[PDB]
Write a protein that binds this ligand. Structure first.
Ligand SMILES: [Zn+2]
Ligand SMILES: [Zn+2]
Ligand SMILES: [Zn+2]
Ligand SMILES: [Zn+2]
Lengths: 288, 288
């Protein structure tokens, strides 16, 4: 679960932290006739979709930066593969210089701490969108939260705090590191943020949880998922993101797009068709 | 360039030998207005398509069988990756017991011998389709071939002769090993052959060069490629194959389908749409 691409002078390695299965009862706006038509289009039997959890290592030439860090053990044994995906890519955890968090959900942030609350990445700066940090640290929010979801707030704080004195809070429109700009993508969480990478005239947008179920939400970008804090907002941000991406032919990556999670969209009627990136033939089998 | 799937009790590993680039002049039946439409559909700029060269390792339980063997060094440094893909899959060349050849073209057969013309797979039986063997050994066919193509005949013969005494010729509808049957797929070469894997009510058809350019030939299965020895017969075989594959939702693999080259088709009009296999998340990620 490690695949390496070139973006100008940057190397981007897709990393598979694992997978989870979701059924229609988490889908906002779901209808069964339409759900079945969409599953039949992808030759999917039954109503479970298997969704990857992806993170991306970017070697900018002078820093090694992770976008998201998977789950650790928080959601069971089907996740937390990120540390061994890193080994596959020839990288140890102690070489990571910075971790850019799209949002502070379990499957993006919890992989930054181990079982003891020890840092997985000893030498990394933890970079958090400050709008998301504020939410997860708000008690009004945490106490108004369905009891089964309170562990998310608590777990998010514990993960962030293992990086006390090595955190940078960022806004949704700022240069973060050379050739990395944040991009506000609010809705899924309040401070959900994508990261735009640019090197030598080439671009990759790492767009976090802009989409969860690619079997449904390219065709029906109006469908949400119950884990969206603000589902109508998330819908507006996805439609805006995909409209832009389609018109610019922007290469993007998504945490829950079938691994490696990278490609482009064509606009089609009132939805989109994803065109997956080709396998990196030359990079792996020539260039280096 | 090694990905592992399960078909019943068989483990099937896709192996990437490398890639090559093709432009419209090799396409039989090509039309520029349609070519550009199909390239726009896949967001391809320019008119070059990069196609993989795939081979497949099948562990049957007690035996390691390759379907095809890549190119070696015979078409330049963009191919010949197979020995290193095998290494990445934790297998060395001396462990391979049998090589089932779909057809004796360079990108399938010549990977069985190194630059000095000695066996790459010291312990393997070379299994050749009898009908294709007959064609490549035909002096009349070799002598009536364009000058640039005569070395394909001579190189086929040398690669086969490296395995003299450890060769088995097979017919186009026979059992090769338990759960593995040959199936004639004539046209691309006279004895071009696919292999059908059947284990515990799961099937995989490894269909060789049934298709070359997936950006065109699923939409336009009536288009051929100049390397088809009889392009009309190749078209007929391809249409019959894809027609059956679509009606039974057969999982199949192709040597030139974007790596890992495995998936299914749905019929749309008198063309087809390819649905690529999911990444093998569970098999390679939930381990004992
Ligand atoms: Zn999320
Ligand atoms: Zn997520
Ligand atoms: Zn061929
Ligand atoms: Zn071929």
């Amino acid at each position: 679960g490690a695949l390496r691409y070139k973006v100008g002078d940057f190397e981007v390695t897709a990393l598979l932290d694992g997978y989870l299965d979701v059924t229609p009862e988490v889908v906002v706006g779901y209808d069964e006739a339409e759900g079945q038509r969409l599953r039949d289009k992808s030759l999917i039997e039954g109503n479970a979709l298997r969704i990857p959890v992806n993170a991306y290592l970017v070697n900018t030439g002078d820093r090694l930066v992770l976008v998201d860090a998977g789950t650790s053990d928080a959601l069971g044994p089907t996740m937390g593969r990120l540390p061994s995906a890193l080994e596959a890519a020839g990288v140890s955890a102690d070489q990571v210089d910075a971790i850019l968090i799209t949002h502070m959900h379990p499957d993006h942030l919890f992989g930054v701490v181990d079982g003891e609350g020890k840092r997985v990445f000893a030498n990394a700066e933890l970079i958090l969108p400050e709008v998301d940090n504020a939410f997860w640290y708000d008690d009004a929010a945490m106490n108004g939260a369905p009891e089964q979801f309170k562990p998310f707030f608590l777990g998010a704080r514990k993960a962030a705090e293992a990086y006390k004195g090595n955190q940078t809070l960022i806004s949704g429109d700022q240069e973060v590191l050379p050739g990395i700009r944040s991009m506000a993508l609010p809705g899924h969480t309040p401070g959900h943020t994508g990261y735009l990478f640019d090197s030598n005239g080439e671009t990759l947008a790492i767009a976090g949880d802009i989409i969860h179920m690619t079997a449904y939400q390219f065709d029906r970008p109006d469908w949400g998922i119950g884990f969206d804090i603000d589902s109508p907002k998330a819908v507006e941000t996805r439609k805006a993101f995909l409209d832009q991406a389609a018109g610019d032919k922007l290469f993007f990556a998504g945490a829950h797009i079938p691994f490696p999670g990278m490609g482009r969209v064509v606009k089609e009627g009132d939805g989109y068709r994803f065109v997956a990136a080709n396998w990196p033939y030359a990079y792996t089998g020539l260039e280096v």
